[PDB]
Amino acid sequence: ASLTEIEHLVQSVCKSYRETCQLRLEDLLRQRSNIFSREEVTGYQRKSMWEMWERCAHHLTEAIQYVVEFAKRLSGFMELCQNDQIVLLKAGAMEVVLVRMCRAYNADNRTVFFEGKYGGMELFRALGCSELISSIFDFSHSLSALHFSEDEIALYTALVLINAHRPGLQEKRKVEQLQYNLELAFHHHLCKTHRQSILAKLPPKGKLRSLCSQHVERLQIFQHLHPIVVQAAFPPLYKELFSGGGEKHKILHRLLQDS
Numbered sequence: 001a002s003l004t005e006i007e008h009l010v011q012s013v014c015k016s017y018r019e020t021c022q023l024r025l026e027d028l029l030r031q032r033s034n035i036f037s038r039e040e041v042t043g044y045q046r047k048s049m050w051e052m053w054e055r056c057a058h059h060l061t062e063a064i065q066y067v068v069e070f071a072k073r074l075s076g077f078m079e080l081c082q083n084d085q086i087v088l089l090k091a092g093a094m095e096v097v098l099v100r101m102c103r104a105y106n107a108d109n110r111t112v113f114f115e116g117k118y119g120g121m122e123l124f125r126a127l128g129c130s131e132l133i134s135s136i137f138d139f140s141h142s143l144s145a146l147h148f149s150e151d152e153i154a155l156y157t158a159l160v161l162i163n164a165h166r167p168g169l170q171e172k173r174k175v176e177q178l179q180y181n182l183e184l185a186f187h188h189h190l191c192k193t194h195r196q197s198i199l200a201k202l203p204p205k206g207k208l209r210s211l212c213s214q215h216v217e218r219l220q221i222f223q224h225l226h227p228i229v230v231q232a233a234f235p236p237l238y239k240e241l242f243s244g245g246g247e248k249h250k251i252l253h254r255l256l257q258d259s
């Protein structure tokens with residue numbers, strides 16, 4: 001590539017990300033005074049473990065659906081073969097959401113936006129996976145300390161998705177070329193904006209792996225305890241990405257073909 005081509009890459013990633021945001025940043029900032037009462041928190045903790053899991057998996061699936069749309073609008077993603085598109089989404093959709101999630105987190109009061117209002121991690125006690133929850137909160141805290149801009153989140157989440165080290169890729173070099181181009185783009189925008197100091201503060205890639213792995217493992221425990229709940233009330237797409245052997249569902253293929 002070259003300079004104008006890299007700066008055009010920057011604008012197009014930023015555009016693709018704006019169009020496939022679930023929630024505008026300003027909508028989430030305007031809502032930060034809107035915080036679950038202690039009575040509403042108590043109501044969340046008294047919800048059954050299985051209904052809370054169903055509600056969280058539903059919200060997570062909705063978030064993942066915008067990540068699929070981000071990828072379909074991302075330069076060069078749709079020139080990749082369908083196997084590689086699917087491998088990249090299967091490994092990275094959760095990761096992209098974990099990163100996008102820091103926009104919904106308030107580091108002043110350590111709350112996250114959830115079902116209309118903001119609540120600390122005690123909101124999620126009924127899940128019985130406090131470790132996974134505090135890790136997600138800790139991770140979102142550390143990303144909020146960096147004061148990402150929206151443009152930076154778009155360029156970083158594009159690299160989270162386009163990772164040429166995902167096992168199972170069939171055109172690894174083609175993904176490597178794509179990755180390298182987005183890294184140049186990311187790093188060029190940081191240099192232009194005097195923000196390269198964040199490079200050494202970004203999370204190691206192992207951290208995102210670790211968070212997804214925790215998620216999948218707690219899902220497995222839960223699915224052993226409530227196998228019919230998962231079968232009957234979790235979203236098909238969620239099951240395709242996260243449970244075993246839930247990829248009998250082929251939703252991603254459908255999402256990727258549909259214009």
Ligand SMILES: CCn1c2ccccc2c2cc(C(=O)NCc3ccc(S(=O)(=O)CC)cc3)ccc21
Binds near residue numbers: 056060097112115
């Ligand atoms: C860490 C606690 N925790 C979970 C733990 C386990 C499973 C699911 C969740 C979970 C889901 C949400 C959620 O989906 N809330 C609505 C929402 C909409 C748009 C945005 S966004 O615009 O930043 C783009 C994704 C952000 C949040 C929030 C917090 C959550």
